[PDB]
Design a protein around this nucleic acid. Structure first.
Ligand SMILES: [Mg+2]
Ligand SMILES: [Mg+2]
Ligand SMILES: [Mg+2]
Ligand SMILES: [Mg+2]
Ligand SMILES: [Mg+2]
Ligand SMILES: [Mg+2]
Ligand SMILES: [Mg+2]
Ligand SMILES: [Mg+2]
Ligand SMILES: [Mg+2]
Ligand SMILES: [Mg+2]
Ligand SMILES: [Mg+2]
Ligand SMILES: [Mg+2]
Ligand SMILES: [Mg+2]
Ligand SMILES: [Mg+2]
Ligand SMILES: [Mg+2]
Ligand SMILES: [Mg+2]
Ligand SMILES: [Mg+2]
Ligand SMILES: [Mg+2]
Ligand SMILES: [Mg+2]
Ligand SMILES: [Mg+2]
Ligand SMILES: [Mg+2]
Ligand SMILES: [Mg+2]
Ligand SMILES: [Mg+2]
Ligand SMILES: [Mg+2]
Ligand SMILES: [Mg+2]
Ligand SMILES: [Mg+2]
Ligand SMILES: [Mg+2]
Ligand SMILES: [Mg+2]
Ligand SMILES: [Mg+2]
Ligand SMILES: [Mg+2]
Ligand SMILES: [Mg+2]
Ligand SMILES: [Mg+2]
Ligand SMILES: [Mg+2]
Ligand SMILES: [Mg+2]
Ligand SMILES: [Mg+2]
Ligand SMILES: [Mg+2]
Ligand SMILES: [Mg+2]
Lengths: 243, 113, 206, 97, 152, 51, 124
RNA sequence: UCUCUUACUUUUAACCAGUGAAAUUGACCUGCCCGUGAAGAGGCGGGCAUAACACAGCAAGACGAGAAGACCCUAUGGAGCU
RNA sequence: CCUCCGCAUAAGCCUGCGUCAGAUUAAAACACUGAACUGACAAUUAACAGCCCAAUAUCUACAAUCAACCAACAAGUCAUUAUUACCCUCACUGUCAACCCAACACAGGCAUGCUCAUAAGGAAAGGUUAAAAAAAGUAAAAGGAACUCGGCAAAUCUUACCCC
RNA sequence: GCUAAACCUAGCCCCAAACCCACUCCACCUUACUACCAGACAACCUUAGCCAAACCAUUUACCCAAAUAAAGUAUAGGCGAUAGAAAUUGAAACCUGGCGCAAUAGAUAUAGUACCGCAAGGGAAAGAUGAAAAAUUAUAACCAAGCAUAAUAUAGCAAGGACUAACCCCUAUACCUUCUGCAUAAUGAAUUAACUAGAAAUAACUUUGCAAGGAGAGCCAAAGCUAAGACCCCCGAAACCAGACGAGCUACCUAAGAACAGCUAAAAGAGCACACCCGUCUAUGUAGCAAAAUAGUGGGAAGAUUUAUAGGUAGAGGCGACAAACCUA
């Protein structure tokens, strides 16, 4: 026979079926965001159309991305939007020669960073692209808070983002006592941030982490039937007496 | 055997007595702790990707240093998802056959009567 | 007492647990199923013990009393009316004792009879407004009663005497239960005076 | 021996069935209904062949196109293999090339 | 008890007590010759020697001096009509030796019956059969096959 | 190479209905004579009207 | 080859396999250094058998007894027939206080006593 | 071993009783000589022979049975190795 | 008359010649009734053997070979102490057989202990006859390798030389 | 007249619709189906190849948005086999069926059972009374090959012409395939029953409809356009690649064991010689006792020995006192 739904809609059906359906709405929308990452290992087309040689005709063009592969070391560290390129090449860049499977790997470096919001020094495996991105963003805090998940490409980066967002939303005693004005100054350096507190928790959470958080949220061990029955009976007694 | 129905009568009488005792116990446990299933457990998902009700086993040391317990795997490793879909499709095929056969039998019955 | 029959099993005038039925339908047997009219439990009127009228057959127009009802094949066996003859005592040197033996009848082959005029009549199940639920005749409109038949217990309750292992009604109905928030274990412990002072301790369930 | 020794049960056919008596009704519905409906829209059946005739390779290709995403795994594997075989047969083998 | 979860005993913990036991035993006749103080039982698999001793001395107040147990393997040789092996259940048998010099001989239950009450459902048909048999066995070799019915 | 014979049959009737049943065999006749009619010894000699 | 379909029992393996498998009997002790088995008296289920000398309740019933409509016992029914009368009386008298439900039969935690209900401390 | 073989015993054998395979088989009412012919005939031409039917042997023929020749060649069929 | 067998343990196997009934049938390479079986009933009883141990430090140079002289090399198969903790006890499992691996009731394969011909365990001939051919033996006049590729085989106990 | 024969209905198939399942108690990741104890390791990765290009070496459709049309167009490409879009267009909510199979068919299915395999894995066969079998009655026979009733008669592809007569007379070199050509002593076939092998386009031809227009959008058109009819087989390698499963045989190794009588003992990878290991030569056997055995005869038998148990190394590999040896006949 046939399935009622196509097999690619099954993930969405599970998302609306159970505890995932009880997950918060903003988290679910962020899960269904499906926005595209910035070109990193390929050059985008500048325009939607392009007049090609061999005929003076305007032809529509689209940029297709490269299936870059991310080892879990990238998730541990802070790379750019770049990973491994698993492709093929021709022997001497001519198609009439052998085709060989090639891998391109990024050049990784170990560097130290400071977070003004977190007031902590982290050692991260970094690359030149993300060093340049930090330079453009004027600070690690700005880079982490400005870059989207589809561009950070790191669970570590998303955890850092959630940490800073929670710090900003809470306005908690960040630095230490005896430095309230410095704490406030660091807080006001990032006003264009700090989404509400109950929304900043679910930032950078995978589906498994979200389901586990929601399951521990609704733990609520059962209440004895004794309390329910006594409440019902006393309400009945009050109703009968007041008449 | 002289009168074998005596054994059946006794067996079902003891079954009824056990039912009565279990009912009283269940009501008392619901009243005092709001629980059924006086054996604690949890819905888990084993190594084959199925959903099972795992009953607990009253150990003497905590689970995080229980060596034998930490060798059982309550998770998927999703090379099992294709097998899950195949089993689902097999179940669907069996159900479709059953419904179609019911339709055919009803049609024959109506054809005669 | 609890034996499951194959999905296509023939009900054949002998009980499924009988030796004759085991001989006739061994577990290896497979044959074409007989297809019967589907009748719900709330429109089967004729019960074991009432008088029916045979509309057709070898004897048409004679009244009789049903002696067995097989609901799995829409069968009602009429007592000694639709009969054929067979021998029962069988040996290799002498066989005799020819007896009449009834053959089953379908439920369209018989009709119910009302005790006023002893005529065939159709029955409709009209729900009485007094609470009970009985049959009603169509042509004349009388209450045809459910006939009294001996039960499957093989007993008569009036001529029943208590055995040495049968509990009497008085001490079988006497209420000794007082509801309480204590378990059977606590109650028997305290009733028999078992003293336990050391406590049960924490155990890890997982 | 191959023939049945008895005559098969006589098969009666009700020519004045509901279906047989109403066969063809509401055909020509476009011709004499101001073309609001096409007769091809009275056809009931599979989603990939309603108002479409097609070859066997064409039928397989169309079925995989229109309904091949919600097919069973073994059925879809069979369809892919059938399309492969039919391609090879209809494009490489036979007379008349 | 059987098919139940035992509470886990911890050192210094209370006594494990069963209030409505789930064990049923059969008193079987020995298939071989046994000492006069030996009583043979057929007990469930989960029952132990201590369990059976306590069972006997608590429910029947039978003084028990010794208990030995063994497991009898049921045959897995019979084939179904589909050539599927039919397994006779494995069971456990126990030999108990009585304590204070008592002896036990297995009783003879079935002998002896002597009853001649009135019957109608089956005895009437038995009288049928017997009378027909006693009246219809009057064949004669001197006749050579001619039916002995007609008066002529 | 694994097949046997079948059709184990017994050709004697028995008393299986009284073994367990709630219906009985309905009889139409009896076993013998309630009391044999002894005929007179000289019935042939007294075959006339009366004596 | 080996019999795949037969159930794996304690009679089937080598000498080491025998004696490790068991038949489902529950342990009543432990093994010490000299292979000596120490039995624990508390690990042996003690049969709680009552006195039946004056007990007038036979394992069967009389047929003269009359039928009754069945009514499975529920927590609501047990509460109604167990705590409702007393709490109604001490509410009508005005002494009922919602804070202390303990004197009506309820208990907050089930750890303190010996026969705890949810984890089912006892046997049967 | 042989000139140069012989005698006996056991097995096998043959007959009687019981149980009871396999390769093979287009159909066969299935002869010899000469000739012929896809070039080596039981079957064709010319002659000759010729009641039917078991059992035990033998191995000249049935280009005898077995294995879609391994030798040789061919295939824009393979594979191992250098 | 045979025994180069056998009895145990291990491993393997898992009720597989114990009783009763059916033997009308059915496998018995035929049969009686029991190894090529149907149903029911019954049995293997622990002392033998499995199933072990509270930590933390610490100790552990000198083979075995009758272990004594002597003699070696390939250099070896076995051990504690100190302090703390600890006073309940005999559970559970294997225990049968004419038996396992070889499609078989298969001249094959199968570890260890014990007597090495037995106190264990077994039967080469269904009956007859006395053909050929064939197989395994025994004996053989005179000759003694003349056989044959070759002393293959058999019988006797055997000298010398060569190649690798 | 034996063996047999025959039978409808279990079920199945393809659609449609609808998103579907799973704790009675107990046990089950250790040797699964095991009541009860102190290192807490852990998954995320471009398929390849057959095949086509008549070799092969770049290349060779197969991916998961309803249709249709643009369009097999633009494009790609040993510019060659072949590969091949998009913009744009527009895609009417409800109805429980069958010119499907009927026991060699239809699911492998009565069952993933029996059986085979160490394992992954492979994988069967089959049933038929009647309202009642609590009718065992007498009917229902008739029909394949194989036989029996009932062996045979000079001579010859088995018959045909005939004839008063079965034979005798006369005439006559089975069939299929393959070939220049076969009675060929070239292939295949014991025989019966059942199953078992021609699938479609461009363009033409015929027959209708309408007609400078045809067509139910798109397309064609200097009589065309629309519609229909008619049309291109079956079995078979040695291969290649991916992923699993295998060292209970065997090769080598690791751990911890065991065995080796007697005599000569030169001291001994010494000699004779048992058990034990191996397999020189002969004979038998060759569908055998045996998918490598038996009898005799032989080589070794305190060592580089033989051997029980558990473990390890695996196929683009392992292991090898190199035999292209062995890695479950
Ligand atoms: Mg013979
Ligand atoms: Mg010639
Ligand atoms: Mg001859
Ligand atoms: Mg010939
Ligand atoms: Mg030949
Ligand atoms: Mg060939
Ligand atoms: Mg060529
Ligand atoms: Mg023994
Ligand atoms: Mg063999
Ligand atoms: Mg003897
Ligand atoms: Mg003999
Ligand atoms: Mg002889
Ligand atoms: Mg003989
Ligand atoms: Mg001589
Ligand atoms: Mg010479
Ligand atoms: Mg010569
Ligand atoms: Mg020699
Ligand atoms: Mg090619
Ligand atoms: Mg080609
Ligand atoms: Mg080539
Ligand atoms: Mg488009
Ligand atoms: Mg089939
Ligand atoms: Mg099949
Ligand atoms: Mg015939
Ligand atoms: Mg002639
Ligand atoms: Mg030629
Ligand atoms: Mg010719
Ligand atoms: Mg030929
Ligand atoms: Mg040829
Ligand atoms: Mg041939
Ligand atoms: Mg090739
Ligand atoms: Mg290769
Ligand atoms: Mg090994
Ligand atoms: Mg030596
Ligand atoms: Mg030697
Ligand atoms: Mg060499
Ligand atoms: Mg070589």
């Amino acid at each position: 026979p046939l399935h009622k739904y196509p097999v690619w809609l099954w993930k969405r059906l599970q998302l609306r079926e159970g505890i995932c359906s009880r997950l918060p709405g903003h988290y679910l929308r962020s899960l269904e965001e499906e926005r595209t990452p910035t070109p990193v290992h390929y050059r985008p087309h500048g325009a939607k159309f392009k007049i090609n040689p061999k005929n003076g005709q305007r032809e529509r063009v689209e940029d297709v991305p490269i299936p870059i592969y991310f080892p879990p070391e990238s998730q541990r560290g802070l790379w750019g939007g770049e990973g491994w390129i698993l492709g093929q090449i021709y022997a001497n860049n001519d198609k009439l020669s052998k085709r060989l499977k090639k891998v391109w790997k990024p050049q990784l470096f170990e560097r130290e960073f400071y977070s003004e919001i977190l007031d902590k020094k982290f050692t991260v495996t970094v690359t030149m692209r993300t060093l340049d991105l930090i330079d453009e963003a004027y600070g690690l805090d700005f880079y982490i808070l400005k870059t989207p998940k589809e561009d950070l490409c790191s669970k570590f980066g998303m955890d850092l983002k959630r940490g800073m967002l929670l710090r900003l939303a809470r306005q908690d005693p960040q630095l230490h006592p005896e430095d309230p004005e410095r704490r406030a100054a660091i807080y006001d350096k990032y006003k264009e941030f700090a989404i509400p507190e109950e929304e900043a928790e679910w930032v950078g959470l995978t589906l498994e982490e979200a389901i586990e958080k929601q399951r521990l949220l609704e733990e609520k061990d059962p209440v004895p039937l004794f309390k329910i029955y006594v409440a019902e009976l006393i309400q009945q007694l009050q109703q009968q007496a007041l008449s | 055997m002289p009168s074998p129905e005596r054994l059946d009568k006794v067996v079902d009488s003891m079954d009824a007595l056990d039912k009565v005792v279990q009912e009283r116990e269940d009501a008392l446990r619901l009243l005092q702790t709001g629980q059924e299933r006086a054996r604690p457990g949890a819905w888990r998902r084993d190594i084959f990707g199925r959903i099972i009700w795992h009953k607990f086993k009253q150990w003497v040391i905590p689970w995080h240093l229980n060596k034998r317990y930490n060798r059982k795997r309550f998770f998927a490793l999703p090379y099992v998802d294709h097998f899950l879909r195949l089993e689902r499709e097999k179940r669907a095929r069996i159900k479709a056959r059953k419904e179609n056969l019911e339709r055919k039998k009803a049609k024959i019955l109506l054809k005669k009567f | 007492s609890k034996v499951t029959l194959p999905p296509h099993y023939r009900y054949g005038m002998s009980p499924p647990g009988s030796v004759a039925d085991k001989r006739k339908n061994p577990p290896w047997i497979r044959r074409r199923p007989v297809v019967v009219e589907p009748i719900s439990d709330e429109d089967w009127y004729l019960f074991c013990g009432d008088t029916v009228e045979i509309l057709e057959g070898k004897d048409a127009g004679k009244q009789g009393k049903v002696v067995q009802v097989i609901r799995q094949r829409n069968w009602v066996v009429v007592g000694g009316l639709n009969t054929h003859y067979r021998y029962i005592g069988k040996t290799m040197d002498y066989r005799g004792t020819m007896i009449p033996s009834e053959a089953p009848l379908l439920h369209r082959q018989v009709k119910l009879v009302d005790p006023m005029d002893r005529k065939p009549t159709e029955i409709e199940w009209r729900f009485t407004e007094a609470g009970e639920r009985v049959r009603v005749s169509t042509r004349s409109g009388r209450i045809i009663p459910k006939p009294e038949f001996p039960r499957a217990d093989g007993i008569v309750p009036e001529t029943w005497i208590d055995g040495p292992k049968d509990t009497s009604v008085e001490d079988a109905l006497e209420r000794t239960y007082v509801p309480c928030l204590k378990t059977l274990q606590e109650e028997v412990m305290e009733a028999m005076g078992i003293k336990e002072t050391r406590k049960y301790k924490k155990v890890y369930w997982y | 021996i191959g023939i049945r020794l008895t005559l098969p049960p006589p098969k009666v056919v009700d020519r004045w069935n509901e279906k047989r008596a109403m066969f063809g009704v509401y055909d020509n519905i476009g011709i004499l209904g101001n073309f609001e409906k096409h007769p091809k829209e009275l056809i009931r059946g599979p989603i990939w062949l309603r108002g479409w005739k097609g070859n066997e390779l064409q039928r397989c290709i169309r079925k995989r196109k229109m309904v091949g995403s919600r097919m069973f795994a073994d059925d879809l594997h069979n369809l892919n293999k059938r399309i492969r075989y039919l391609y090879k047969h209809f494009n490489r083998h036979g007379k008349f090339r | 008890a059987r098919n139940v979860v035992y509470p886990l005993y911890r050192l210094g913990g209370p006594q494990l007590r069963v209030f409505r036991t789930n064990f049923f035993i059969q008193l079987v006749r020995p298939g071989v010759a046994q000492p006069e103080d030996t009583v043979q039982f057929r007990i469930p698999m989960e029952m132990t020697r201590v369990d059976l001793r306590n069972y006997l001395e608590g429910i029947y107040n039978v003084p028990v001096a010794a208990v030995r147990t063994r497991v009898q393997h049921g045959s897995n040789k019979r084939r179904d009509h589909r050539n599927v092996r039919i397994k006779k259940p494995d069971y456990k048998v126990a030999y108990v030796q009585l304590a204070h010099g008592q002896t036990f001989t297995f009783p003879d239950l079935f002998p002896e019956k002597d009853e001649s009450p009135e019957g109608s459902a089956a005895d009437d048909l038995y009288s049928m059969l017997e009378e027909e048999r006693q009246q219809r066995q009057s064949s004669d070799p001197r006749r050579g096959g001619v039916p002995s019915w007609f008066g002529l | 190479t694994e097949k046997e014979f079948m059709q184990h049959a017994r050709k004697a009737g028995l008393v299986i209905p009284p073994e367990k049943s709630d219906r009985s065999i309905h009889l139409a006749c009896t076993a013998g004579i309630f009391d044999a009619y002894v005929p007179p010894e000289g019935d042939a000699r007294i075959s006339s009207l009366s004596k | 080859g080996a019999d795949r379909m037969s159930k794996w029992t304690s009679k089937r393996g080598p000498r080491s396999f025998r004696g490790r498998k068991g038949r489902g009997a529950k342990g009543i002790g432990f093994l010490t250094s000299g292979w000596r088995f120490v039995q624990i008296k508390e690990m042996v289920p003690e049969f709680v058998v009552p006195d039946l000398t004056g007990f007038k309740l036979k394992p069967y019933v009389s047929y003269l007894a009359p039928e009754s409509e069945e009514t499975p016992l529920t927590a609501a029914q047990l509460f109604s027939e167990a705590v409702a009368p007393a709490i109604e009386k001490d509410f009508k008298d005005g002494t009922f206080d919602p804070d202390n439900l303990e004197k009506y039969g309820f208990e907050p935690t089930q750890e303190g006593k010996l026969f705890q209900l949810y984890p089912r401390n006892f046997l049967r």
